[PDB]
Symmetry: D3
Subunit: 312 residues, 6 copies
């Protein structure tokens, strides 16, 4: 089931074919049409009005710049445009039909009452028009290019963390710090770095744009639970694999035997790990709130061990 925004969220209607966005303004000359994306052109933003009654399950597309609603009809010219009255006419209601395969994140905006589908193309004129809904062409598909949203918070569902793999990794094996006997001091210093992995994968809810940059603590396995490592301050990219460093540092000393050659082996458990999470976002322009569910996954390490053993 594709994600359809609620009434207070704004978006751009990007065409698969034209690779351009629909615009609706009060001037210049042409009131509605297509244009290359310009994140600041209020012109290019719309929100939806959820149909009710006999329109339940349908939607009206409202211009943020004009407040007017889009329409699509086949008899009267022009076949498409704007109009007042938030869905006053049957011409303002559309059915959202998700595509398949390469068009799975796209959809047709079909207006039932007239059996017409919106068109967004650059090869034929008018670029923004409609077509008899029964003959499906690729240039009738649209995808949501949502407004800039800010990631306010990431909350992991730690109780459900899970370890997918685990192999011990010896950080500092070599350790032949010795003497003959009755010394008094032998200190060890551990400083090893492992390149870790991080990926925040979409599961459900609001469709955060792939690549969106943000910061958050990342999961860590303690000994019997998962915890959030707030130290990691790297910049992540939504839905993409990121890498970050994890350095293990430790200082310990050993010496109090009849005569030994102290040995220290620092070891950690490394492997793949994933944890569910919810992200809270809000509109930068409005503050409108939404959530997104996801699964975080990455190569990590845990259970740092220091084993001391004497030799003679």
């Amino acid at each position: 089931d594709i994600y359809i925004p609620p009434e207070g969220l704004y978006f751009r209607l990007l065409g698969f074919a034209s690779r351009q966005v629909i615009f609706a303004r009060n001037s210049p000359s042409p009131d509605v049409g297509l244009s290359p994306v310009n994140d600041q052109a209020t012109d290019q933003y719309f929100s939806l009005i959820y149909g009710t009654g006999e329109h339940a399950g349908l939607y009206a597309i409202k211009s943020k710049a004009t407040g007017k609603v889009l329409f699509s009809r086949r008899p009267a010219e022009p076949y498409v445009g704007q109009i007042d009255g938030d869905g006053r006419y049957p011409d303002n209601w559309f059915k959202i039909e998700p595509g398949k395969t390469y068009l799975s994140k796209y959809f047709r905006l079909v207006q039932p009452s007239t059996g017409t589908a919106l068109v967004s193309r650059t090869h034929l004129q008018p670029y923004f028009w409609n077509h008899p809904q029964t003959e499906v062409f690729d240039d009738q598909y649209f995808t949501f290019l949502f407004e800039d949203m800010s990631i306010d918070k990431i909350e992991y569902d730690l109780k459900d963390g899970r370890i997918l793999s685990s192999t011990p990794n010896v950080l500092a094996t070599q350790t032949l710090e010795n003497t003959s006997s009755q010394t008094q001091e032998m200190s060890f210093n551990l400083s090893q770095t492992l390149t870790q992995t991080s990926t925040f994968a979409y599961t459900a809810g609001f469709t955060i744009a792939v690549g969106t940059a943000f910061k958050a603590g990342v999961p860590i396995f303690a000994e019997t639970e998962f915890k959030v490592d707030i130290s990691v301050d790297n910049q992540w990219n939504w839905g993409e694999e990121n890498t970050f460093s994890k350095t293990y540092t430790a200082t310990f000393s050993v010496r109090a035997g009849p005569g030994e050659t102290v040995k220290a082996v620092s070891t950690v458990d490394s492997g793949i790990i994933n944890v569910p999470f919810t992200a809270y976002l809000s509109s930068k322009s409005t503050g409108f709130e939404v959530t997104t569910e996801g699964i975080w996954r990455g190569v990590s390490s845990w259970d740092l061990r220091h084993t001391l053993t004497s030799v003679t």
Copy 2:
């Protein structure tokens, strides 16, 4: 080696540049040209005629709507079009030259005899034309947009299943169901759910369109073999990672000692797993059959354990 369809399979010739498909009809006015995809326009489908003799290794592109074959020549006008006689003229044979990098799933359709390459563009006219084969431009590349195929069957090669990782995961650890002694009944109920993973990756054979929706049992590791779990009835998307739930349920009771505090620990082995498979497909319009080889991979769980231990 790119996948070239056999003689009975239909497809659309999508251009890298124009992002449009070639069409060949008997009318209206222009007989051949470019058009946005329309899965129902017979107009846009072609199949290949495998060259033989001195043409072995070359192909003729036959219109499904017209039966006519495409041609490409540089002296006589028009330089491209249709013509009867399934490869009667040397102008009907083409060499398929796979591209590299971003064009690896695309190819040029070069007609040797004339040293000309087909062209599919929208920036210059004619949109469907040809060019002296020696000067390679991006708008000379095409990719196969195969006909809608149905996935009739998935057959796993279970003998070759393989476990990539494995870590024990305790589903229900806590279990302090007690009394002092000589009770008579202490029953346990286990109900834990794990989010699993599923991906059907292409290996060879017919190139199933990424995203194609279908249903099939998914692999499972028994104790010494792999088996197909037919219960999982989720809808998969070819070549993409899907998730699904696996719930473990169990009821067992323990009590017959001198005086105990029965403890139950339910545990499973979880980790990554993959298994080879063959998919059998057939043309929805013709029933023409083909196969696709692939490797299925996913996070799974297995070997559910229930350990009972008394305490006093």
Copy 3:
């Protein structure tokens, strides 16, 4: 931080919108403009001249075919074009502004002194023009389509290899080669094949084009170190997952007891593994050198074991 080429490396400036490359020649008629990629058109290659002084942090875009530099101004017509003097005029310096989200691998070429941004479109004329830098449109973004580079060498940083997972896999379990007693010979032959995995992932440095084909040994885990398996001679594709076969073959015989039924179990450790690496490349036309850092990852196997045990 996006990768900006040094002064001696050539590239094409591909537009996000137009999906076309900028060209600068001495003739025919129009000197600069847009064109579909043609890897042999010297016309389409440029290199950068690193600004210094008050221009430090800015760049001039030099035509490889003409030696002339690009410019962008808003008063005098034409607003864009070529000109001698490697950055003689303030009009030749540009600021490279990386985009975000879907435009993260793209950037604007803004000329500060005039507050103008280059434009690359096919929907409006002139196709190659500029726009008041303050109004950002999608057709103002460009990405680097670097010159054909050759991968001369792959050097792994073996000391940092790491095992992400590990599960024992018994290749040949069944082995009931017997007799009663005092025989004299019982030989075993092992021949098992496992499909392995290989991926060379970009980490930093020169951005090798995804898909680039090349050959190199692949990492292998010995017993206490990682080593390069030079036998694997498959063709890899940069930044993509490849598969390859690994066959284990072995012949051993056992017999010298009071009366036994020799059993042989061949086993290997399989799991995921990754190792850092540096790739050395050079321009095919110039020999200009660069490097790329990356992490190699794949499903592998190691520690082949043969265990013999008698039965009676």
Copy 4:
């Protein structure tokens, strides 16, 4: 260091050679001499009077029947006998000289002041006499044949228990209680017996006679501590290995899956184990108290496990 009884404990003086006990009575005719043991003849019991002053480290041997003390002199006849005054004369003090090898649990009773040693023989007359202390003969050795003591209590030092060995032992392996699916009940009954071991070994303190019969709980390993199993009510023999039965009984049922063949494997950890202990004894005739330290050792079992696993 041999165990010398305190002043209130009674004993018999058994001779190595004569294999007979010393007696001291008021009548019949001969007042002191040798006799076969008769546990009821008060005649044969003596206790010691710890010398003090210049006699510190020496002892007087007091008759329980007569109260008189033994003496040994070489000039005046008879050379040995009884006499009043609890050590009034220098002739009443003896030095206890432990033997070696086969005489390690025996000792000479040498009277320094006169350089004479007591004699207990049956081959020459007088049977009970003395000899010039400088010429050591075997018939000058004695051992303590203590009075009947009762073992009132055994207290183990559980904190110091120790596991010497441990191997898992599967009690009930076979378990193929099945059906096809959706049954509802499958109960299991475990009843297995293991022959255990028990030995109470002397360490220090009062020398309990080997073989002495008594009853006490025996050590058991819980999961993280040792505990006393009070159920075992077998009769032990001090300082000797005893065996006893341990039966494990358990009843548990399992069934609540999509279709399984429930399997149950009952397992225990068996091995050698030992624990220190103190025994409290008291004179049956007097109630005089003493203690004995010892180490208990035996083959035991612990950590009974029940593992349930489904099959299909």
Copy 5:
């Protein structure tokens, strides 16, 4: 409960004090008395006649040489001797009273009807006499010195074998048999000897004399069961620890890789083990049969492993 022989088994009555055996003959002069053991003197053998009726629980001691029965009375002289009629007189019945501690394997032969106990001493005359049963002296104790019995068979209860400990022991670790590559032959020879242990401990039934020499196979652990190793042909001594050698020999060759340094590690599991058993014996003079239950225990080894691994 002490072991009392059935009616057909012969024995000598050895006295604790006298350390001599009772004899009953028809001549010379003294008919009954004491004598140093002489295994061939029929004179010294007796068997028992189980009392019945009011004598149930009592026994008559019958001379094997004379057929006459022993008697004990206090009025008429002599107080002890022989007499016809297998228990005709009340004087022929005795109660067997086991001693404690050092006398636990000894017993008094008390004749109730007269309140008299048999006496066996060498310090007073008559050496063989009796005493008022109420005054217990050490020289009233006897032990059974059974007739020479032959151990016809040892049958182990293998199903109940048990492993008390287990630690892996590498027989032949070192193994660096190599070459560079493509050799063709590398054979290994294993010959290691371990000193094993063997003890047949009495549990119940006939009391086989400690030290009795005999031969039998000894237990061995296969892989899932215990088996009898019939190869071990050492001479055992009943109830005593014996040692014996176990040599592991094996010849195996390995070579068929791209280039290796074959390594072989031969390993075994060693530890303590015990198994119950029954011994079948019979009188050498009569063939009278009996059985003895026991537990066999010893340090053993099992599960010989040969692991081959290549190096480069």
Copy 6:
């Protein structure tokens, strides 16, 4: 095969029955006879003269005090005694016939030429006599009561050490030495004592008297070999189980993390262990040398581990 001393070793001939030793002197009156042991009476020591020629396999018993040899004949009186000429007469040669069962460490001294066996008794006169060799009585058995020997050295065959059992034992588990973060010092002190075991068991060679006290280092398992722990300075008793203390002491400190609660777990491997050995002894009076082979066995511990782990 019983141990027969070589020609230069002295011993006493102790009788089973008489429990007395044979003596041969030049005066007083009776030249040969029996006597209670007196370790200083040269009178009681003899050595053997190995027969050769037709006497090979027989021995003469030579008096150390007199140099004369023992004899045994049945016609001429006295039947036994001394005589010059180290075996001059056939009467001086004896066959040593080991007994069985309770007489396995005893033997008859039979003089073939006359068919007579030596006798050692106290119940009949003469106490030291002989008897017609064909009628075997218990008082014809003798055992060797060797001269006082000194244990000069114990040499273990470390290469053959063997671990019979092994279970980890945590000495100091509890360890919650903490703070919040950035402290700087946290030191640990380990001091735990384990009661160990020691037994030197006879295997072959000279029969060292049971109980003989001596001192020697005891075996210890390092990590890959056995070594002698020379610290243990306890007094051992040949052929008997001894106990001794082993204390593990260690001081180590840990602290250098972002914020932790350092935990330390000290652990050791404990279990049963045995090692072969040879003992070198020599006569205290002569210095005559001999050796004894044996197996040392005991409960020990090894591989002390210190594991440090942080908590938060």
